[PDB]
């Protein structure tokens, strides 16, 4: 696929596997809630999210920017605040996963900022080229 | 002379990872229960068991035969029956994990019988060796 998107998605996957998934006791966040185990969950939570889903989205290049990636990461926490309550142990774990994500993004800030820019510019460039043919 | 023990443990580990862990949406059975998330679990359950624990046991050659392995596998279902109840969906998943394990052991039954015998024979030749 396109080189800059491949590079941006490579970094996001390292943040999920290297940092977020390594949070202790984070495993209940690694896959979607089993509707059979938790029948209520899909009734209450309008937008389920988990780290496997984010990895598949990365692999499909859903995320062209840090902001779209963070929207899905933040939903993991919001869903736990809502379903499990804001002081619940599940929510403390979710907050740790969100916190390591933001900390790790800050570390790749320079590169990610540039890649984001490069992907935006290329899109408008392809539409401009198609106009000129 | 632990070649047969190593080969036996290799087969059990692959039953765990390729068969038992591959039962769908069975993640909760792949890790020990942590009392922080299910604070009442250990009021009820004496001897916890999970598939990551069984993998650790196999890596240390805990099991010299099917009987000791199956004690641990069957403990996973017995604990879900007790904690979640016999008709819980958690129990229904634990029963699929046990059934795919028995099914696979039955496929490999004659080879596992042979490895179990050779594990005992190696140990004996060594005990006779050591005894004198």
């Amino acid at each position: 696929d396109d080189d800059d998107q491949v590079a941006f998605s490579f970094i996001l996957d390292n943040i999920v596997t290297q940092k977020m998934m390594a949070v202790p006791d984070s495993w209940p966040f690694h896959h979607p809630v089993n509707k059979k185990f938790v029948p209520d969950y899909y009734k209450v939570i309008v937008n389920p999210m988990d780290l496997e889903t984010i990895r598949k989205n990365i692999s499909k290049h859903k995320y062209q920017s840090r902001e779209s990636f963070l929207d899905d990461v933040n939903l993991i926490l919001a869903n736990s605040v809502k379903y499990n309550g804001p002081e619940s142990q599940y929510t403390k774990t979710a907050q740790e996963i969100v916190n390591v994500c933001y900390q790790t993004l800050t570390e790749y800030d320079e590169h990610l900022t540039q890649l984001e820019k490069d992907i935006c510019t290329a899109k408008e460039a392809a539409l401009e080229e198609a106009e000129l043919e | 002379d632990d070649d047969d023990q190593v080969a036996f443990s290799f087969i059990l580990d692959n039953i765990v990872t390729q068969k038992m862990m591959a039962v769908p949406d069975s993640w909760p059975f792949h890790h020990p229960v942590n009392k922080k998330f299910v604070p009442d679990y250990y009021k009820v359950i004496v001897n916890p068991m999970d598939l990551e624990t069984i993998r650790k046991n196999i890596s240390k050659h805990k099991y010299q035969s099917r009987e000791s392995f199956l004690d641990d596998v069957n403990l996973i279902l017995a604990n879900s029956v007790k904690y979640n109840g016999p008709e819980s969906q958690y129990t229904k998943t634990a029963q699929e994990i046990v059934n795919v394990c028995y099914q696979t052991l039955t496929e490999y039954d004659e080879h596992l019988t042979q490895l179990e015998k050779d594990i005992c024979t190696a140990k004996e030749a060594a005990l006779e060796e050591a005894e004198l």
Binding site: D40, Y41, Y83, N84, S88, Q89 | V38, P39, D40
Partner: peptide, 7 residues
């Protein structure tokens, strides 16, 4: 199960 659904 356990603390799940407490909110």
């Amino acid at each position: 199960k356990g603390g799940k659904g407490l909110g």
